Structures are given as structure tokens and as C-alpha cells.
């Protein structure tokens, strides 16, 4: 009885199969990760477009068909990193995990979802090039060798007065600097640079304050940030976990209450009840992983890390 046609896409694979009508989110998730051979599953989730066309995370503790998925066939899901580590070097152990994060993060940088200044864009492109092409080779890598590739954000190409040959030269010089680097180490170096970007690993929600002024909430691995409507880079106010006594939710309102009782409460509003609920859930998830990564590695993790440096 496998009567529900699904398509799950990762950053570089497409899976098409059928599920039973009683299949839970977890069961669907488990089949995907088994198929692709991913073990570092804690970072990941399945995203779908609801009936209004909003991106939504599948809840793994509910049946698939009981959730606001659309009425198309096949049902369409994206398997994506949902939670980001505090440090890629310490926490992305296996090559597959590193690759999935690399491709997702790179897509966001090239699509201008994650802001990157031009110099960082160039350095990131140089590592992407090392990973794709291996060592720079003057014999082979003639002028124009990068001409096909999408290597920089359009904003960086729009806003500036270099041409595309001049952009290739910008990247080429750094490509040549990485000579001898293993392609996988280039992917790790990419992620090391990207994880320091202001927008990296931040989930933004449109909110208002108690006077009705528009702001953003960001939720990330370390806590919550409040941003000016016109600036998603520099937080107006930061709330690391350690400074939060509780968050009190009431319909569309959430109130951040400090540990410091001699500090004030901060009141904001989500545009919809469903969104406020999503804010809580993503806060709870992030905070759990925050606690977990500070505990000693599980046996499974200790073995994966051993298996990984065995492979050198």
C-alpha cells in the first residue's frame, strides 16, 4: 500500500518514490537519509511549499498527509540543512555533510540570500574553483577558463566597474595560491570563511514592535537578534540564550524576558499565529543543539571522527 508519490531533492540528488498514506515525517526523513547515506542527520529537515506557497519545515512527529502540504502529485520536498553548527571544522565530520552544507551555503551566497562583500566573494569563488577544477595549471587553465561558471553574486557583478575578464583575474590569483590543496579541504575552507558572514545561519522573520514599527527577528545557533527593518546585518539588540529567562508567547505576541530582572521585557509581534508558533519551535531546536554540542561527543560521533581522520 504505497500510494503517495513523493519527490525529495537534496542539493545534488533527486529521489522519486512512493510512501504509504500513514507515513510520518520521521519515516519519510529516515528513508531519504538512508538512501543518500547521511548520518549527521541532526542538522537537516524537509521543506515543502504549503497551499499558499510558503516554505514550511515538515514536522517529523506528524503524518505527512496531516500537514499543510499541497494537493499535487508528486508531493515535492527539499532536503536541506535547517540547523547550522557553531564551527564547521569541529562539527561537520563526514564528507557528505560538508558537501551538502557547502552547496546550500554557496547557493545562498550566489543568489544574494546571504550577503557577502566583494573581497569575500572573490576568496570564496577561489575555493569553489579549487574544489571543482583542482590545481591551477598554466598549461590548461588559459585566459577564459572560468568564463562558463557562476562564481560571484550578481550584486557584486552589477554594482562594480570591473568587466568579467577582470573578475576572472581577481579569482585566478587566489586559485593559484591554493595549489596543492585537496578538493575537500577547499570545501572546508569555503565554509570556514562563509560561517563568519553576518547573515550566515540566520533565520529571519518579519515582526513589529509594540508601536507597530517594522523590524526583523533573527534566530540562529546562539540566540535571537532584533534588526532594523533596513539592516539585516548588524543587530539592533542581541539576546544570547544565557541572557533569556523565558519567552512568553500569547497569540501573535512574544515577550523576551531577561535573566536580569533589573532589565525590561521586550515585546514583539509576528504577523500570524502560525508564524509565532514557528518562531518558538525553531528557538527550541536551536537551543537544544546549543546544549548538545557543549556536551561530550556521543559514541557514534566519536567513531565517525576516528573513521574520518583514518581516511587520510
Amino acid at each position: 500500500p504505497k500510494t503517495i508519490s513523493v519527490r525529495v531533492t537534496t542539493m545534488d540528488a533527486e529521489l522519486e518514490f512512493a510512501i504509504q498514506p500513514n507515513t510520518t515525517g520521521k519515516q519519510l526523513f529516515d528513508q531519504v537519509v538512508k538512501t543518500i547515506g547521511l548520518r549527521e542527520v541532526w542538522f537537516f529537515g524537509l521543506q515543502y511549499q504549503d497551499t499558499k506557497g510558503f516554505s514550511t519545515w515538515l514536522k517529523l512527529n506528524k503524518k505527512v498527509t496531516a500537514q499543510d502540504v499541497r494537493k499535487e502529485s508528486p508531493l515535492l520536498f527539499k532536503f536541506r540543512a535547517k540547523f547550522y553548527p557553531e564551527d564547521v571544522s569541529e562539527e561537520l565530520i563526514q564528507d557528505i555533510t560538508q558537501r551538502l552544507f557547502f552547496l546550500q551555503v554557496k547557493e545562498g551566497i550566489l543568489n544574494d540570500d546571504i550577503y557577502c562583500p566583494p573581497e569575500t566573494a572573490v576568496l570564496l569563488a577561489s575555493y569553489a574553483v579549487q574544489s571543482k577544477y583542482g590545481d591551477f595549471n598554466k598549461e590548461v587553465h588559459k585566459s577564459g577558463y572560468l568564463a562558463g561558471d557562476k562564481l560571484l553574486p550578481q550584486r557584486v557583478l552589477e554594482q562594480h566597474k570591473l568587466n568579467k575578464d577582470q573578475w576572472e583575474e581577481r579569482i585566478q590569483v587566489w586559485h593559484e595560491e591554493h595549489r596543492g590543496m585537496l578538493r575537500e579541504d577547499a570545501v572546508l575552507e569555503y565554509l570556514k570563511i562563509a560561517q563568519d558572514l553576518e547573515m550566515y545561519g540566520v533565520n529571519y522573520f518579519s515582526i513589529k514592535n509594540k508601536k507597530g514599527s517594522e523590524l526583523w527577528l533573527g534566530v540562529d545557533a546562539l540566540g535571537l537578534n532584533i534588526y532594523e527593518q533596513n539592516d539585516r546585518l548588524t543587530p539592533k539588540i542581541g539576546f544570547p540564550w544565557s541572557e533569556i529567562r523565558n519567552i512568553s508567547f500569547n497569540d501573535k505576541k512574544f515577550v523576551i524576558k531577561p535573566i536580569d530582572k533589573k532589565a525590561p521585557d521586550f515585546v514583539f509581534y509576528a504577523p500570524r499565529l502560525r508564524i509565532n508558533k514557528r518562531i518558538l519551535a525553531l528557538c527550541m531546536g536551536n537551543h537544544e543543539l546549543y546544549m548538545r554540542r557543549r556536551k561530550p561527543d556521543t559514541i557514534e560521533v566519536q567513531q565517525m571522527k576516528a573513521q574520518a581522520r583514518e581516511e587520510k
Binding site: 540564550w241 533569556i244 529567562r245 523565558n246 519567552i247 512568553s248 508567547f249 500569547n250 497569540d251 499565529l273 509565532n276 508558533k277 518558538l280 528557538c283 527550541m284 537551543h287 546544549m291
Partner: peptide, 14 residues
């Protein structure tokens, strides 16, 4: 239900 929700998320104390 309907419009109505309340929840207090209390973070672990030391």
C-alpha cells in the same frame, strides 16, 4: 484553538 495560543518557554536554570 482558533485565534488563541499561550505558551511560556522557560530556559534551563544553571
Amino acid at each position: 484553538g482558533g485565534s488563541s495560543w499561550e505558551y511560556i518557554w522557560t530556559l534551563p536554570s544553571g
